[PDB]
Design a protein around this ligand. Structure first.
Ligand SMILES: Nc1nc2c(ncn2[C@@H]2O[C@H](COP(=O)(O)OP(=O)(O)OP(=O)(O)O)[C@@H](O)[C@H]2O)c(=O)[nH]1
Ligand SMILES: [Ca+2]
Ligand SMILES: [Mg+2]
Lengths: 178, 887
């Protein structure tokens, strides 16, 4: 039993960091833009040992053309965003939700909050002070997922590796059922 | 553009290649209508097609130079006299102005295309055409033809609708086997080739597993087939990293089930360095490459410049290393004529032969082709048959006696042999005459032979050795470019039953028979004996073999013996030759018009030794040095007096094993075709709905006693239809060790470009305890053993190089090996007793997180054979050996 999933986000938000940490338990040191990556990992949930295949996407304009490569029918398609950037909270769910529905319906979605560790960092407040912004609140994270009709909401931290394993457990179980 | 015959393959003179490209005015002659017209033939910008039209069908048509089999000048079919009167031209010589192109799509269809042009035009037209066909001749013998498949497919898309554009991604992906999918559009050839590569590297899981085991975490940042034709090799530069990532991305997403998804993690990339790659060649491949050669492989296969610079080999480099033409199973690929094997007498060689060359199909109702003699002789066949019966006008006509098959003039069949006898090969051809002709005509059958062949025909003993006390037939090398005919020679002082030749034979035709004096088989139960070449139908030879097997082997090793299918095979089928090849029979005549298994064995056997048609017989025969000379009885059902050489075969996976059938359930059947003691078949469990990259991973073990003559046969079979769709027959003696690719072929024994199989084949061996002797030692003659050599890599050798390969004899021991290592370093005074060879076993494993297990150590005691220990390393157990020198 092998499942399939696809992950999208706002770019430079931790889409690649989440997978490397989960599959390698090592936080990336040097950032490199990602075009298209495929990973395979094994996870046991509720006594079910199911192979998990991860499909990595990109949001850059030059890489927006080849998004349909990983779109075709899959058990689940996940969603990710940067908690530090309120912009990703609005545009990304609205940008990709019609795209996900159009390309492959009947695919449950999960909303994942990235960069949770630095949400309390002092540097974030100063940087967002110039732009008149604040870190994405937990309350709006759950509400946004409900607005786009998703399976649920979660938050992850690549550096601290806190809550990362939870998303896969919840995501994998949904794939087999329904 | 997209030259169908690339520039790096052609060897045409610049001026000559321009003349064909620009065009010329020539007269097109049509034999069927027997009316010549004027035309203007031009060579298309792609060097494949020839097109002729009315100058500024008879005058409208197109020829595909990938179907031309040969080009002749002054083919007697052209009627220069008819052309001159039709075109009111002055006197012309056909041997100076005629051009012909024998082309066809099958071994039974051989058309003709006639062009006659002025003297000056003929030279350039023919000279250029010969080079174009020669390139076509080579391109269809290349082992790896992945690129030549893309050229045809791309150009076919280019001209499919009449609109000059490439194929869309949906079509490109589908053609390569990817998912049946929009965004992109017509793609240039480079973007098309660069997509196939991603499909051949991202669709092979089995090459990822063989990479994980031997990889190390070394970070990411610090006359043959021309290399430009080889898709995999790096020098085939004839796109930025951004495009390549897209190409791999789409390829890795289109594959369905078995695919090495494009994993890209920084600071966590693995590789196969110089030392790591060496451990892969020493144990699995068995290849022993020096430090420079191993490094040269790194510089030649690794795509990434960063990796290639720091002596690493990423997955693309390693995956592309196992798909190269140097990692194909058969050693017969790119095999050239070996002039040393062609020195023994002619009785010791298996000679390629055909039974009814003139017939093109059924042998009781069908056509007789004059040009099928040229088609067969181009394949390399070295023996042919002529059923000269009787001329209604007095000139003999060849056909199947007392049957409805069409009659062809004899004069045009002897000519057909001459124009194409020695085009491919140069070894002598033995012509067999079923001379059903009255005395008067045989005089007109002897003039034709001497008039046409002239010097090629043998009229008298050409070599002094033929006058010895007990002469033997001359070596095939001595008779190079010669023709010998065989039939009854004068003794100097409902099924048609037409086998009886003419009772009386002319004294002119018989005088031409020299080295093959056919006579009725005297028997084994009952001039020198080395000349008489009998001819026994399969039933008579098969019956003779079983009753007198041992007697026959010592008979056919001193005189030839021909065999042809039985008369009962009106279907025009073939007998299985392995029954006769074991006993030394040389001329096993076969029906080349029918393509069945018995004809693939003949093709498989004779593709070796350069394809000359003469393959030396196993040394157990014809050799008095072999300890098993007179004791070999192939028909015996059980011989427990020797230890066979156990063989292990593993069908790891296959790629595109069902061409044109995306949906299928292929299973590979491996049949060992040898004696009745070591012949067996195996079946791999079917894999459903997967032909792009099926992966069964079965293992098969078989023991072979007489390994000199055994033919493996891999045959893809769809369980849904139970119909073969790709087969390949290779001798076990010509099967490379280790992880090698096998190139499959279709039912007509034509090369499938993309289809192949990935197999692991290691020749194990049992330990000789003295009770019984190894099979290899017995059959293999003592003299041939001296020619055997082995290379062993020793680490820690003095000098900058981490290791070096030393060539040693089979019997070399550890004591000698120390002297060889210390022999090189004469500058430093070193004592042999100081050094001692040590054997290591590095317990590498797919798992890398855990700490490496300590390498096992041992001391190679003196007098212990060093080749023997090298054969004890089984990487299946998870360890890779090293012969390391230490103080
Ligand atoms: N400290 C911290 N930084 C994070 C966290 N999540 C994401 N980031 C930042 O986001 C970047 C993630 O970049 P990538 O790993 O390439 O993934 P991406 O955001 O999709 O970027 P692409 O390569 O374009 O796909 C990292 O370099 C981090 O600096 C987090 O949880 N903690
Ligand atoms: Ca005959
Ligand atoms: Mg990324």
């Amino acid at each position: 039993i092998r499942k399939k999933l696809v992950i999208v986000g706002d770019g430079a938000c931790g889409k690649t960091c989440l997978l490397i940490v989960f599959s390698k338990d090592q936080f990336p040191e040097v950032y490199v833009p990602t075009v298209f990556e495929n990973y395979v990992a094994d996870i046991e949930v509720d006594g079910k040992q199911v192979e998990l295949a991860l499909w990595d996407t990109a949001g850059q304009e030059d890489y927006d053309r080849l998004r349909p490569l990983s779109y075709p029918d899959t058990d689940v398609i996940l969603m990710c965003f940067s908690i530090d950037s309120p912009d990703s909270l609005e545009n990304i769910p609205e940008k990709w939700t019609p795209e996900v529905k159009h390309f492959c319906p009947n695919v449950p979605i999960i909303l994942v909050g990235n960069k949770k560790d630095l949400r309390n960092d002092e540097h974030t407040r100063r940087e967002l002070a110039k732009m008149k912004q604040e870190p994405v609140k937990p309350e709006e994270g759950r509400d946004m997922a409900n607005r786009i009709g998703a399976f649920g909401y979660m938050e992850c931290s690549a550096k601290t590796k806190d809550g990362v394993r939870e998303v896969f457990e919840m995501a994998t179980r949904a794939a087999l059922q329904a | 553009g997209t030259e169908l015959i690339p520039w790096y393959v052609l060897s045409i003179q610049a001026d000559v290649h321009q003349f064909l490209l620009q065009g010329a005015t020539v007269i097109h002659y049509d034999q069927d209508t027997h009316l010549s017209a004027r035309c203007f033939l031009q060579l298309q910008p792609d060097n494949s097609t020839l097109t002729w039209m009315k100058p500024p069908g008879l005058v409208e048509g197109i020829l595909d130079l990938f179907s031309v089999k040969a080009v002749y000048m002054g083919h007697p079919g052209i009627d220069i006299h008819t052309v001159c009167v039709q075109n009111k031209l002055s006197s012309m010589l056909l041997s100076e102005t005629g051009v012909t192109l024998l082309y066809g799509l099958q071994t039974t269809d051989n058309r003709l295309l006639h062009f006659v042009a002025p003297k000056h035009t003929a030279k350039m037209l023919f000279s250029g055409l010969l080079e174009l066909t020669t390139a076509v001749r080579k391109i269809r013998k290349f082992p790896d033809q992945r690129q030549q498949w893309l050229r045809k497919q791309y150009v076919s898309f280019y001209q499919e609708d009449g609109r000059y554009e490439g194929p869309t991604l949906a079509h490109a992906v589908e053609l390569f086997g990817g998912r049946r999918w929009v965004s992109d559009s017509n793609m240039s050839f480079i973007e098309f080739v660069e997509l196939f590569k991603s499909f051949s590297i991202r669709s092979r899981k089995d090459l990822k597993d063989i990479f994980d085991i031997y990889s190390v975490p070394c970070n990411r940042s610090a006359d043959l087939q021309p290399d430009l034709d080889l898709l995999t090799r790096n020098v085939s530069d004839l796109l930025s990293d951004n495009q390549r990532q897209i190409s791999d991305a789409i390829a890795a997403a289109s594959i369905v089930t078995n695919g090495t998804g494009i994993e890209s993690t920084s600071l966590g990339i693995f590789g196969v360095g110089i030392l790591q790659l060496n451990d892969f060649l020493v144990n699995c491949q068995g290849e022993h490459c020096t430090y420079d050669e191993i490094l040269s492989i790194i510089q030649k296969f690794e795509p990434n410049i960063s990796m290639c610079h720091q002596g690493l080999l990423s997955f693309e480099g390693f995956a592309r290393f196992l798909m190269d033409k140097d990692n194909f199973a058969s050693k017969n690929d790119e095999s050239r004529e070996n002039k040393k094997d062609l020195q023994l007498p002619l009785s010791y060689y298996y000679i390629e032969s055909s039974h009814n060359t003139y017939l093109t199909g059924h042998q009781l109702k069908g056509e007789s082709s004059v040009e099928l003699y040229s088609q067969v002789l181009l394949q390399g066949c070295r023996s042919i048959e002529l059923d000269c019966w009787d001329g209604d006008d007095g000139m003999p006509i060849i056909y199947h006696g007392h049957t409805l098959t069409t009659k062809i003039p004899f004069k045009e069949v002897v000519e057909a042999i001459d124009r194409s006898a020695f085009i491919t090969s140069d070894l002598p051809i033995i012509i067999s005459i079923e001379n059903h002709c009255s005395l008067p005509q045989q005089r007109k059958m002897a003039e034709i032979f001497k008039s046409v062949f002239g010097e090629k025909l043998v009229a008298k003993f050409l070599f002094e050795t033929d006058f010895s006390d007990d002469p033997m037939l001359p070596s095939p090398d001595q008779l190079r470019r010669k023709v010998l005919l065989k039939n009854k020679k004068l003794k100097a002082h409902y099924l048609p039953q037409n086998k009886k030749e003419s009772r009386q034979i002319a004294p002119e035709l018989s005088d031409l028979v020299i080295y093959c004096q056919a006579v009725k088989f005297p028997g084994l139960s009952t001039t020198p004996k080395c000349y008489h070449i009998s001819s026994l139908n399969e039933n008579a030879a098969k019956r003779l073999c079983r009753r007198y097997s041992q007697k026959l082997i010592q008979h056919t090793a001193c005189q030839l013996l021909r065999t042809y299918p039985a008369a009962t095979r009106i279907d025009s089928s073939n007998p299985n030759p392995l029954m006769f090849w074991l006993h030394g029979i040389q001329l096993v005549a076969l029906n080349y018009q029918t393509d069945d298994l018995p004809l693939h064995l003949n093709a498989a056997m004779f593709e070796a030794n350069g394809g000359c048609g003469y393959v030396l017989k196993p040394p157990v025969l014809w050799d008095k040095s072999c300890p098993m000379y007179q004791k070999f009885s192939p028909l015996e059902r059980d011989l427990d007096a020797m230890d066979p050489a156990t063989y292990s075969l593993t069908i790891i996976s296959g790629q595109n094993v069902c061409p044109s059938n995306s949906t299928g359930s292929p299973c590979i059947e491996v049949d060992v075709l040898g004696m009745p003691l070591d012949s067996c078949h195996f079946r791999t469990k079917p894999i459903h709905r997967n032909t792009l990259n099926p992966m069964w991973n079965e293992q098969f073990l078989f023991r072979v006693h007489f390994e000199d003559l055994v033919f493996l046969r891999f045959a893809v079979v769809e369980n849904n239809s139970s119909a073969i769709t790709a087969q390949r027959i290779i001798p076990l003696k010509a099967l490379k060790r280790g992880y090698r690719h096998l190139q499959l072929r279709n039912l007509h024994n034509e090369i499938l470009e993309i289809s192949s199989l990935f197999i692991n084949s290691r020749r194990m061996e049992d330990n000789p305890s003295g009770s019984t002797r190894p099979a290899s030692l017995m059959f293999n003659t003592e003299e041939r053993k001296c020619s055997q050599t082995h290379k062993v890599t020793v680490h820690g050798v003095p000098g900058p190089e981490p290791f070096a390969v030393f060539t040693i004899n089979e019997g070399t021991k550890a004591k000698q090996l120390l002297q060889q290592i210390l022999a090189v370093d004469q500058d430093t005074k070193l004592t042999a007793a100081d050094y001692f060879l040590m054997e290591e076993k590095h317990f590498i494993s797919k798992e890398k997180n855990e700490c490496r297990k300590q390498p096992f150590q041992r001391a190679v005691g003196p007098e212990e054979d060093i080749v023997q220990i090298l054969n004890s390393w089984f990487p299946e157990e998870g360890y890779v050996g090293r012969i390391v020198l230490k103080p």
